[PDB]
Amino acid sequence: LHKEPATLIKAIDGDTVKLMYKGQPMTKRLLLVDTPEFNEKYGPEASAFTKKMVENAKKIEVEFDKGQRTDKYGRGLAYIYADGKMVNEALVRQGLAKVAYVYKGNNTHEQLLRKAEAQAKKEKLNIWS
Ligand SMILES: Cc1cn([C@H]2C[C@H](OP(=O)(O)O)[C@@H](COP(=O)(O)O)O2)c(=O)[nH]c1=O
Numbered sequence: 164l165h166k167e168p169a170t171l172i173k174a175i176d177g178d179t180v181k182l183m184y185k186g187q188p189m190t191k192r193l194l195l196v197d198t199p200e201f202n203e204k205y206g207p208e209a210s211a212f213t214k215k216m217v218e219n220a221k222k223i224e225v226e227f228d229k230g231q232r233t234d235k236y237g238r239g240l241a242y243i244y245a246d247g248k249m250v251n252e253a254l255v256r257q258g259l260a261k262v263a264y265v266y267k268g269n270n271t272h273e274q275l276l277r278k279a280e281a282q283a284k285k286e287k288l289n290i291w292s
């Protein structure tokens with residue numbers, strides 16, 4: 164996989180962000196994770212965590228997996244990096260997202276994320292508390 168440049172347009176919620184990618188505005192949905200909706204428990208914390216991560220970043224990168232790059236809603240499916248740190252993994256490590264939506268073909272970082280989820284659950288963090 165390769166990292167490609169993008170710039171933040173707007174934080175949306177815990178697992179979606181609006182970025183400018185190849186010069187077009189696009190809503191990116193984070194691969195392999197599920198954050199609670201803003202209206203559910205830890206939803207506001209997940210949105211806040213992602214917002215901080217992307218808004219503080221000096222460099223945001225998008226990394227597509229091997230499979231489909233857009234979902235049925237037209238959202239980009241990607242791993243997103245903020246100054247080299249993966250947002251998807253960070254949310255999971257903090258117990259603010261579950262590993263989820265693991266489809267054959269877009270799952271290169273599954274093991275990495277499940278490893279994070281295990282540590283988060285061990286520490287009884289947030290969703291696991
Ligand atoms: C993460 C991801 C979600 N999706 C679709 C599945 C779900 O369809 P449904 O909307 O019919 O349930 C939806 C969940 O996204 P959200 O968690 O943002 O609601 O996004 C994909 O198709 N591929 C993916 O990799």
Ligand SMILES: [Ca+2]
Nearest residue numbers: 178197198199
């Ligand atoms: Ca969600």
